[PDB]
């Protein structure tokens, strides 16, 4: 299972992670005790680690599906 | 109501539309009569119109969500 950013997000604080549409986001914690806020998760995109709004990602992506026949 | 590509799709036919993950895809028809094959939809990306595998897109996109409070 992977998560994919479905929207761009621009940090309004230094501990926040920028998201761009289509980014694969590695979800490192869903626990508010770590993100510091309900509805914020901790993740990584490329080399960057920070918190991001959980409603900006969708569980989806990974291996591309086999396309239907033509 | 927006559709987003969740995976990259490399065309393998002259009427096929390339997708890149995170692209918004304007869906012009879901009808196989139009696409010419079940599970292939017709759409527009980047000014080009062609067909793509319907299993590469997800309904979602539109406006970025309201982020939760910190």
Author numbering:
A (entry chain B), B (entry chain A): 44 to 113
List passages from the publication reporting this PDB structure.
MLK3, also known as MAP3K11, is a serine/threonine protein kinase involved in regulating the JNK, p38, and ERK pathways. It is composed of several modules: an SH3 domain, a kinase domain, tandem leucine zippers, a Cdc42/Rac interactive binding (CRIB) motif, several linker regions, and a proline-rich C-terminal tail. The SH3 domain has been implicated in the autoinhibition of the kinase domain through an intramolecular interaction via a nonconsensus single proline motif located between the leucine zipper and CRIB motif in the full-length MLK3 protein. The overall structure reveals a five-stranded antiparallel β-barrel, a characteristic of all known SH3 domains, and three loops (RT, n-Src, and 310 helix), commonly involved in the recognition of both proline-rich and nonproline ligands.
In this study, we also mapped the location of the canonical binding site on MLK3 SH3 by solving a structure of the SH3 domain of MLK3 bound to the NS5A-derived peptide (APPIPPPR). The crystals diffracted to 1.5 Å with an Rwork/Rfree of 18.8%/22.8%. The NS5A sequence crystallized here is from a different genotype of HCV but carries the same PXXPXR motif that is conserved across all HCV genotypes. The NS5A peptide interacts with the canonical polyproline-binding site by forming contacts with residues Asp-58 and Glu-59 of the RT loop, residues Asn-98 and Tyr-99 of the 310 helix, residues Asp-80 of the n-Src loop, and residue Trp-83 of the β3 strand from MLK3 SH3. Alignment of both complexes shows that the two binding sites are on the opposite faces of the SH3 domain. Interestingly, Asp-80 and Trp-83 of the MLK3 SH3 domain participate in binding both peptides; however, in the case of Trp-83, the side chain is implicated in interactions with the NS5A peptide, whereas its backbone carbonyl interacts with MIP. The Asp-80 side chain is the only one involved in both interactions; it is oriented differently depending on which peptide is bound and interacts with arginine residues present in both peptides. Finally, the shift in the n-Src loop required for MIP binding likely interferes with the binding of NS5A, further explaining the competition between the two peptides.
